[PDB]
Amino acid sequence: PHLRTFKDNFQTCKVEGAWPLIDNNYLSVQVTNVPVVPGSSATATNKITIIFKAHHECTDQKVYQAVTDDLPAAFVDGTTSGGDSDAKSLRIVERYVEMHARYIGTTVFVRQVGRYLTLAIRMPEDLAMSYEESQDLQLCVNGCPLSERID
């Protein structure tokens, strides 16, 4: 999987299995990887998990999960909108499937290309630079580990 960080850095990391791209107190992103050829350097994403944190007054905690040959327009809870039905803060639009979050100014673009999924996230600076204790492993913000990197 070809990585494009917020700092405009291009790195080719293997990132075999479950690895976190975005991890904070406003948004959680988890992706798993499997090689297309058995016992090879090349890898590709097969499952994307987006978790929205429980915020008072706006939206309840809704877990999104997307796998191979499955592009859901809703969360595992079955609901299309975040939190209450009357609340229009968190919404998912389908055509290509896109996510809109006005409470954390993010737009996630997901689509199936061949046999593997694609990902595109647009987030502001202040929300992208949020981190708690023992939270320093972000592949979307900072560069991927040199162990997974191929040179």
Partner: peptide, 15 residues
């Protein structure tokens, strides 16, 4: 009320 009141991009695609 619930709304936000520079955007940074992040990409991920297979080989």
């Amino acid at each position: 009320p619930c709304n936000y009141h520079s955007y940074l991009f992040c990409g991920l695609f297979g080989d």
